[PDB]
């Protein structure tokens, strides 16, 4: 089964790199540190079925951060509408989006 | 301007290796109480050009029992890997600046070994097979030794770059801190370049020509160009790593001149070794490396792990 000699002896052989929001080398992050932190802090203490039920908001936010399916679909919809308007001649892109922009530092 | 930079890197290297062939013939002759070529050119300087024209105007002579795809791929692969290996060297500013320059060097050298192996297997002949197997043994031994040597030396250095090697050797060479690593690295560069004493892949006496025994003129010239370019490159890498040329921010021309002088000296040292020594057996090369260099370099790698810790001389990251 699952022995717990690491919890019994108090050592941490492989427990500090179980997930993304856990002890990055110098001081770095893992691109979804806040979302994974919120999800784990939600799910701790009520784990299993209750964590699957009433931490669905935090899990959905974290999964959206990590996989970015909804952002991809939103950006694809925007670009598809833009290309349709370009074909229909009803849209001209601004100078900053298409071509020369004013650069700021 | 970048293509002009590519030309000014590539064309001088090819002329340098052709005159390396000339210098090798003349140095071997004068160590053999004779001359080199002195008839084709004013002082033999047209001899490599005559050799190149003759080789490229003879027929390539594709054989019957031969995997043609690998037979054609292997020499072009060898030449392009030699030039790609020449790419990231700083004198003192590289054409292409790589963070993991030494790792790039190691990968390209192993791929050159693959070029030799594919040529030997594709030219479906027994002597070619013998040369390919000898290449396998040789690259096993020198690959493990070279990896340990570079690990310890670049642990004395900072990152895996080469401008960092210039800044490390700004005040003093690396030969004085690590001279046993320099000796083992010189022997390993001989093994990498398949040069005398332990050539063993183009062994003219044990075999007929080794892996080139079925390669007629053309691709044979390509293999020769790759080998001699690798000779100049390994000597250049040795003088960048260990015999650090003088670097000044205001002018780099004296750095280039010092690098040229030391690279010429080490190339002439290679020709000197070829004139001096007989050939190893290819099991004796493996025994020599794995029983003398590998334990000593493991111990010296441990010593160079411990040295910056107990001297507090850990190099900077950049």
């Amino acid at each position: 089964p699952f022995l717990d000699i690491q919890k019994k002896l108090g050592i941490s052989l492989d427990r500090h790199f179980m997930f993304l929001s856990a002890e990055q080398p110098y001081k770095n992050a893992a691109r979804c540190h806040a979302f994974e932190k919120e999800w784990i802090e939600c799910a701790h203490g009520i784990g299993g079925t209750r964590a699957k039920k009433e931490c669905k908001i935090e899990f959905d936010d974290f999964e959206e951060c990590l996989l970015r399916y909804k952002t991809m679909r939103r950006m694809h919809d925007i670009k598809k509408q833009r290309e349709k308007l370009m074909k229909e001649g009803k849209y001209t892109p601004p100078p900053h989006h298409s071509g020369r922009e004013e650069p700021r530092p | 301007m970048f293509f002009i930079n590519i030309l000014t890197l590539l064309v001088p290297i090819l002329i340098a290796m052709a005159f390396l062939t000339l210098v090798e013939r003349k140095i071997l002759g004068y160590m053999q109480l004779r001359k080199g070529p002195n008839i084709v050119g004013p002082y033999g300087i047209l001899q490599p050009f005559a050799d190149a024209m003759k080789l490229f105007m003879k027929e390539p002579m594709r054989p019957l029992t031969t995997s043609m795809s690998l037979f054609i791929i292997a020499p072009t692969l060898s030449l392009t890997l030699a030039l790609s290996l020449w790419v990231p060297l700083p004198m003192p500013h590289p054409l292409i600046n790589l963070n993991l320059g030494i790792l790039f060097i190691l990968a390209t050298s192993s791929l050159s070994v693959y070029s030799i192996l594919w040529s030997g297997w594709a030219s479906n002949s027994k002597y070619s097979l013998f040369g390919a197997l000898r290449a396998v043994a040789q690259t096993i031994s020198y690959e493990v030794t070279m990896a340990i040597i570079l690990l310890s030396v670049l642990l004395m250095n900072g990152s895996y770059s080469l401008q960092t090697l210039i800044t490390t050797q700004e005040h003093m060479w690396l030969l004085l801190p690590a001279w046993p690593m320099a000796m083992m690295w010189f022997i390993s560069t001989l093994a990498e370049t398949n040069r005398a004493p332990f050539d063993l892949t183009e062994g003219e006496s044990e075999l007929v020509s080794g892996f080139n025994v079925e390669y007629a003129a053309g691709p044979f010239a390509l293999f020769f160009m790759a080998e001699y370019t690798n000779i100049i490159l390994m000597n250049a890498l040795t003088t960048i790593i260990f015999l650090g040329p003088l670097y000044y921010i205001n002018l780099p021309e004296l750095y280039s001149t010092n690098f040229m002088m030391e690279a010429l000296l080490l190339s002439s040292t290679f020709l000197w070794i070829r004139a001096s020594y007989p050939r190893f057996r290819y099991d004796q090369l493996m025994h020599l490396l794995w029983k003398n260099f590998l334990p000593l370099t493991l111990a010296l790698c441990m010593w160079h792990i411990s040295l910056p810790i107990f001297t507090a001389g850990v190099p900077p990251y950049m």
Binding site: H16, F17, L20, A22, E23, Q24, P25, N28, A29, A30, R31, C32, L66, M72 | -
Partner: protein, 98 residues
């Protein structure tokens, strides 16, 4: 990134099909095994680089070490098979059915 990950998963699937479908060569089976290994290495490295999981970056090195250990053991077993028969044929090693 999702297109590349789909391609890497399909590459692993192809190497698994190569492992499962034998063609007379234990060496070719070991080659398919190491193709699966390479696909998994590339998948893990791309995932860690995309998620910035520098703490989980030792995982590809670990799988490479253990994969080379298993490739070493497979080459040793292939050496023993060749010493037994001389041909290295998976259909030739079949005498344990009875």
């Amino acid at each position: 990134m999702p297109s590349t990950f789909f391609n890497l998963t399909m590459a692993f699937s192809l190497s698994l099909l190569g492992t499962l479908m034998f063609r007379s060569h234990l060496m070719s089976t070991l080659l398919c095994l190491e193709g699966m290994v390479l696909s998994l290495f590339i998948m893990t490295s791309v995932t860690s680089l995309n998620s910035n999981s520098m703490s989980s970056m030792p995982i590809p090195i670990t799988i490479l070490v253990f994969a080379a250990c298993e490739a070493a053991v497979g080459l040793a077993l292939l050496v023993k098979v060749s010493n037994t028969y001389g041909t290295d044929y998976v259909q030739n090693l079949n005498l344990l059915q009875c």
